[PDB]
């Protein structure tokens, strides 16, 4: 269905874990900043 | 609008960068594995 998540800053602890990278240009495209709620959906 | 991205494994280089964490249970909920295309949308 969909995942409700938050944009975060990757920490040392996150290495090796699954993530979706969102760079600054992608963040400007969708209008998000660290801490914002986003929806992650399979294509 | 929306961001088209891929589930990845966070590397050492990703520390300090913005990401959306998707743990195994979230991955089972949406049906994704590392390498899969997902859409990231602002709420």
Numbering used by the authors:
A (entry chain A), B (entry chain A): 1 to 43
Copied sentences from the primary study:
Here, we study fold transition between distinct β-barrels by protein engineering and structural biology technique. Here, we discover that the previously reconstructed ancient DPBB sequence could also adopt a β-barrel fold named Double-Zeta β-barrel (DZBB), as a metamorphic protein. The DZBB fold is not found in any modern protein, although its structure shares similarities with RIFT and OB. Furthermore, the reconstructed OB fold could also be converted to the four-stranded SH3 fold by a simple circular permutation. Thus, these ancient β-barrel folds (DPBB, RIFT, OB, and SH3) could be readily interconverted by a few feasible mutations through the missing-link fold, DZBB, indicating their significantly close evolutionary relationships.
Design-1 exhibited the metamorphic property, adapting two different folds, DPBB and DZBB. Different ligand molecules probably induced the metamorphism in design-1. In the crystal structure of the DPBB-fold, two malonate ions bind to a positively charged pocket around the α1 helix, and are coordinated by Lys24, Arg27, and Lys33. Alternatively, in the crystal structure of design-1 with the DZBB fold, two additional residues, Arg21, and Arg18’ from the other chain, coordinate the two sulfates. The sulfate ions may attract these two additional residues in the folding process, and then stabilize the inverted β2-strand in the DZBB-fold. We also found that high concentrations of sulfate ion (≥1500 mM) increased ANS fluorescence. Its spectral pattern was slightly different compared to malonates, perhaps due to the difference in the DPBB- and DZBB-folds. The changes in the CD spectrum patterns depending on the sulfate ions were also observed. These experiments demonstrated that the small ions mediate the folding of design-1, and their types may lead to two different structures.
